[PDB]
Amino acid sequence: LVPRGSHMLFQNVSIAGLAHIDAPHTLTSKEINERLQPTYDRLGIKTDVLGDVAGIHARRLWDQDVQASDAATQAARKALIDANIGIEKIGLLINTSVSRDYLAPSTASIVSGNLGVSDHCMTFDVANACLAFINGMDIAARMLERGEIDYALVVDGETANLVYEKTLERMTSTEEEFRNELAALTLGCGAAAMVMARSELVPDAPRYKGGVTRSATEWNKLDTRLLLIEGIKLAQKTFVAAKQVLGWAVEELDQFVIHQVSRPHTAAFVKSFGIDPAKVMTIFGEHGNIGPASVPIVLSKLKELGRLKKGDRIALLGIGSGLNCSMAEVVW
Amino acid sequence: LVPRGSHMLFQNVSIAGLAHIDAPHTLTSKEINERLQPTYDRLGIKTDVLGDVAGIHARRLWDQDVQASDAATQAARKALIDANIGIEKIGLLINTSVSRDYLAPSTASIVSGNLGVSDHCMTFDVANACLAFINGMDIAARMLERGEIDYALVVDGETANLVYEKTLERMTSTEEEFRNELAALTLGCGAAAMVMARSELVPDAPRYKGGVTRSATEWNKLDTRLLLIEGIKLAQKTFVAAKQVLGWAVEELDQFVIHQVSRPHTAAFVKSFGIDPAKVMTIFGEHGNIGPASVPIVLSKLKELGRLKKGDRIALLGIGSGLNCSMAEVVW
Numbered sequence: 001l002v003p004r005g006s007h008m009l010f011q012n013v014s015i016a017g018l019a020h021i022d023a024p025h026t027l028t029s030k031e032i033n034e035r036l037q038p039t040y041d042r043l044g045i046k047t048d049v050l051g052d053v054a055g056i057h058a059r060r061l062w063d064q065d066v067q068a069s070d071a072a073t074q075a076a077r078k079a080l081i082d083a084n085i086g087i088e089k090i091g092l093l094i095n096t097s098v099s100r101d102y103l104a105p106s107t108a109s110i111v112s113g114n115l116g117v118s119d120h121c122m123t124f125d126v127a128n129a130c131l132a133f134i135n136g137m138d139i140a141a142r143m144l145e146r147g148e149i150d151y152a153l154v155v156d157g158e159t160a161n162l163v164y165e166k167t168l169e170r171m172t173s174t175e176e177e178f179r180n181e182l183a184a185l186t187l188g189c190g191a192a193a194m195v196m197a198r199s200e201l202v203p204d205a206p207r208y209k210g211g212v213t214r215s216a217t218e219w220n221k222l223d224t225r226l227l228l229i230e231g232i233k234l235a236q237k238t239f240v241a242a243k244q245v246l247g248w249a250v251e252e253l254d255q256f257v258i259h260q261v262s263r264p265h266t267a268a269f270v271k272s273f274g275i276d277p278a279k280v281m282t283i284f285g286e287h288g289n290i291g292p293a294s295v296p297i298v299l300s301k302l303k304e305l306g307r308l309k310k311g312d313r314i315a316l317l318g319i320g321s322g323l324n325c326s327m328a329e330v331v332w
Numbered sequence: 333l334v335p336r337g338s339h340m341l342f343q344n345v346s347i348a349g350l351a352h353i354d355a356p357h358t359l360t361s362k363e364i365n366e367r368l369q370p371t372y373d374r375l376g377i378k379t380d381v382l383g384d385v386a387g388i389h390a391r392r393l394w395d396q397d398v399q400a401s402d403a404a405t406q407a408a409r410k411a412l413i414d415a416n417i418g419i420e421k422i423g424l425l426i427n428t429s430v431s432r433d434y435l436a437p438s439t440a441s442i443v444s445g446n447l448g449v450s451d452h453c454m455t456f457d458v459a460n461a462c463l464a465f466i467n468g469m470d471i472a473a474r475m476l477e478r479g480e481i482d483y484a485l486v487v488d489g490e491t492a493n494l495v496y497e498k499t500l501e502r503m504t505s506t507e508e509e510f511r512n513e514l515a516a517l518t519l520g521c522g523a524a525a526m527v528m529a530r531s532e533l534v535p536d537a538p539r540y541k542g543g544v545t546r547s548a549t550e551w552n553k554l555d556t557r558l559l560l561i562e563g564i565k566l567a568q569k570t571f572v573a574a575k576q577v578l579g580w581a582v583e584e585l586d587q588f589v590i591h592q593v594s595r596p597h598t599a600a601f602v603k604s605f606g607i608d609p610a611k612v613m614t615i616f617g618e619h620g621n622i623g624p625a626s627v628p629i630v631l632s633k634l635k636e637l638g639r640l641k642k643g644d645r646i647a648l649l650g651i652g653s654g655l656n657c658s659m660a661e662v663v664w
């Protein structure tokens with residue numbers, strides 16, 4: 001009768017399986033810089049912007065012309081293994097990548113066809129910059145909770161190679177334009193997939209509780225000074241919302257799985273919220289920003305390291321273009 | 333305890349408001365054909381493929397460089413008026429268009445910012461070719477049903493002008509390639525938006541019951557002979573599913589609001605299912621295929637014509653690239 005925060009949380013939604021794919025090829029910021037040197041020289045800019053301002057030592061790239069759907073499909077096969085279920089069990093497949101094979105059909109229908117889903121399997125893409133994998137989790141969770149389905153896949157493959165190819169070409173003949181282009185050189189490749197399920201079908205798997213979103217769509221035109229200040233302001237509001245629904249206090253969370261934009265942005269965020277940096281696994285310095293796949297890759301890598309115990313409270317969160325901010329909880 | 337079809341239907345989800353935007357400019361197939369004549373002549377093809385095979389007399393185009401987000405925003409303003417609510421009430425805004433301003437941020441965040449949504453408003457894009465507006469309705473419905481929100485916007489703006497510009501340029505210097513390009517000349521421009529709400533907040537508005545999806549993702553590579561046969565096979569399965577959940581028999585539905593691909597595809601569909609053509613409003617011959625906006629535009633135009641009575645059972649359905657097929661019901 002009387003609303004309470006906890007009411008909107010999911011009771012019956014679990015994480016059956018989880019996997020990631022590291023893209024194989026290392027591209028160092030040192031090697032990029034040699035290609036950019038002569039235009040560093042010409043513009044008169046003596047600063048290693050990627051290595052010294054962003055904090056990226058390297059990113060991963062695909063070795064071949066991998067489509068988003070291929071990377072997602074690889075990750076999905078691994079996640080099904082992790083969940084020990086066959087594709088016939090999946091009732092929903094949501095693709096959340098920024099990378100996209102086509103305008104139509106959906107990347108999800110391409111991945112679904114690759115995997116061999118059944119005729120009952122609903123499929124579509126969600127796009128929301130860096131936050132879409134959490135949005136896909138929540139969309140799937142609602143359907144699991146209600147019982148419309150028993151198992152869902154949420155998949156995300158990202159490819160940056162053609163971005164890099166083109167960006168590096170376009171900054172080897174203006175400072176204003178050239179500084180805009182440096183930011184694409186912090187992106188990386190990779191994939192992730194998650195099998196979600198109804199909790200009773202999967203007794204004692206990790207629980208997805210759901211979470212909260214706040215937005216500042218007034219800022220949909222985004223600098224980087226401004227992405228940062230407005231982004232932190234938005235996160236603050238969002239943490240209030242998380243307190244009100246999830247009961248969050250920063251000190252009670254065991255791990256923060258955080259979308260990563262750059263070394264200084266992350267530092268600023270963790271400082272502003274008094275987060276312990278030891279609870280913030282980071283892959284940005286050697287993998288770059290994997291867009292919406294960053295959050296589930298980091299979760300999967302935490303899992304694989306044996307970094308988690310039954311009961312551990314894991315915060316999934318990011319700030320995305322929009323601006324949007326989403327915060328959700330997994331209890332391992 | 334025992335599942336029944338009706339269980340998954342939404343009980344508490346209504347349609348508060350609905351609007352569409354007709355794009356202003358008429359472009360006749362006669363005028364296109366004069367531009368294509370000399371390449372009709374060169375390839376030796378004497379058939380009016382657009383006028384005589386597709387059945388499109390004209391399509392609507394924008395007069396100016398309208399972005400999808402602008403068209404969606406226009407439609408959304410009209411829908412809020414139709415619902416007699418201000419933007420502050422909206423808790424969710426989903427954009428479903430194929431047309432898209434950017435890779436990031438979402439088109440939805442751009443529309444949200446234009447409208448002035450509150451900081452509590454969740455936003456994202458769903459992409460699923462021609463069926464995404466029904467997918468967006470259902471995603472919103474789940475959140476309305478559970479009470480996470482009270483009012484949602486589902487918006488869709490489409491623009492084909494740059495498609496036309498480029499396609500007409502690219503077929504005025506191979507038959508195989510040229511026939512592939514004729515199909516883009518059946519697309520049209522337009523927009524639609526829908527305000528959904530919790531039924532008690534909106535006593536006696538149209539009810540959204542939800543619906544069903546079946547898929548044939550084996551066919552994500554799609555001819556047109558094959559789009560048709562496999563598409564009808566898929567629709568047949570989907571109608572079985574609709575029977576099992578919604579209780580559908582074709583003769584008990586009052587109106588069929590059907591995504592439209594072409595005159596012969598529609599004819600084939602309606603024949604194959606024994607549908608009465610008088611219950612199938614069509615705008616394709618003068619507006620062309622508006623992609624995922626086609627279904628809500630047709631619904632809105634039915635509304636505006638005074639074509640609906642309290643209690644009327646309206647079938648929303650389409651076949652989309654994937655292949656996917658979705659079928660849902662509104663009770664006016």
Ligand SMILES: C/C=C/C/C=C/CCC(=O)[C@@H](O)CC(N)=O
Pocket residue numbers: 128129130131227228231232260261265266269289291319320321436
């Ligand atoms: C901590 C503050 C961060 C400011 C936000 C920047 C937006 C980041 C990006 O551009 C992408 O990496 C993620 C995204 N945009 O959705």
Ligand SMILES: C/C=C/C/C=C/CCC(=O)[C@@H](O)CC(N)=O
Pocket residue numbers: 104460461462463559560563564592593597598601621623651652653
């Ligand atoms: C009635 C049979 C139809 C065959 C399906 C064709 C796909 C149609 C399209 O290409 C678009 O108009 C709609 C869509 N593809 O999602």
Ligand SMILES: [Mn+2]
Pocket residue numbers: 024025026063
């Ligand atoms: Mn290599």
Ligand SMILES: [Mn+2]
Pocket residue numbers: 356357358395
């Ligand atoms: Mn005009």
